[PDB]
C-alpha cells in the first residue's frame, strides 16, 4: 500500500513529510501533523533570510520551536523540550522531520538529509 511504502521510506515517536513549496503534501508519515499554509510561508521566508524565524520561533502544526543553528538557505533546525524539528529545502519541496526522545536529533537529521538527497538527485 502507499502508506506502508511511505512509512518505511520516511521517518516513522517521530514523523516526517515531503511538502511542496506551494504547501501541498507529497508524502507524510502516519503521525505527521496537519499544518497551516502561513506556516509554510514563514518557513520559505527563513530559507531566503536566515534568522528570520529566530525572534518569533518556528511554528508547525501550531507547535512552537526555538530556532537553532541550521544551514543557511538550506536547513532549518528547531528545538522543543526533548525533541525538535529539521526542515531541508530542495528544488521543489521541503523535507520535514519531527522527533521526540528517545529519537535523537541525529537520527532525524539523517532521515531528512537522505530524503533531500534523493529528491535533489531526481531534480526536485
Curated annotation (Swiss-Prot):
Official protein name in the record: Profilin-2
Key words of the record: Actin-binding, Allergen, Cytoplasm, Cytoskeleton, Disulfide bond, Phosphoprotein
Protein family per UniProt: Belongs to the profilin family.
InterPro entries: PFN, PFN_euk, PFN_sf, Profilin_CS
Chain span(s) of sequence motif Involved in PIP2 interaction: 74-90
One Pfam entry name: Profilin
Gene3D superfamilies: Dynein light chain 2a, cytoplasmic (3.30.450.30)
Post-translational modification (record): Phosphorylated by MAP kinases.
Localization terms from the record: Cytoplasm, Cytoskeleton
Quaternary structure annotation from Swiss-Prot or TrEMBL: Occurs in many kinds of cells as a complex with monomeric actin in a 1:1 ratio.
Organism: Betula pendula (European white birch)
Main localization, broad class: cytoplasm
SMART domains the record matches: PROF
Any one Gene Ontology molecular-function term assigned to this protein's record: actin monomer binding
GO cellular component: cell cortex; cytoskeleton
Functional note: Binds to actin and affects the structure of the cytoskeleton. At high concentrations, profilin prevents the polymerization of actin, whereas it enhances it at low concentrations.
Keyword Oxidoreductase: no
Further information: The variability of the residues taking part of IgE-binding epitopes might be responsible of the difference in cross-reactivity among olive pollen cultivars, and between distantly related pollen species, leading to a variable range of allergy reactions among atopic patients.
Amino acid at each position: 500500500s502507499w502508506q506502508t511504502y511511505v512509512d518505511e521510506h520516511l521517518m516513522c515517536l517521530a514523523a516526517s513529510a515531503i511538502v511542496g513549496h506551494d504547501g501541498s503534501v507529497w508524502a507524510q508519515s502516519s503521525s505527521f501533523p496537519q499544518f497551516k499554509p502561513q506556516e509554510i510561508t514563514g518557513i520559505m521566508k527563513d530559507f531566503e533570510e536566515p534568522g528570520h524565524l529566530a525572534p518569533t520561533g518556528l511554528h508547525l502544526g501550531g507547535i512552537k520551536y526555538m530556532v537553532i543553528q541550521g544551514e543557511a538557505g538550506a536547513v532549518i533546525r528547531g528545538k522543543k523540550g526533548s525533541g525538535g524539528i529539521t526542515i531541508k529545502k530542495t528544488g521543489q519541496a521541503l523535507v520535514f522531520g519531527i522527533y521526540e526522545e528517545p529519537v535523537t536529533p541525529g537520527q532525524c537529521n539523517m532521515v531528512v538529509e537522505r530524503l533531500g538527497d534523493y529528491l535533489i538527485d531526481q531534480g526536485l
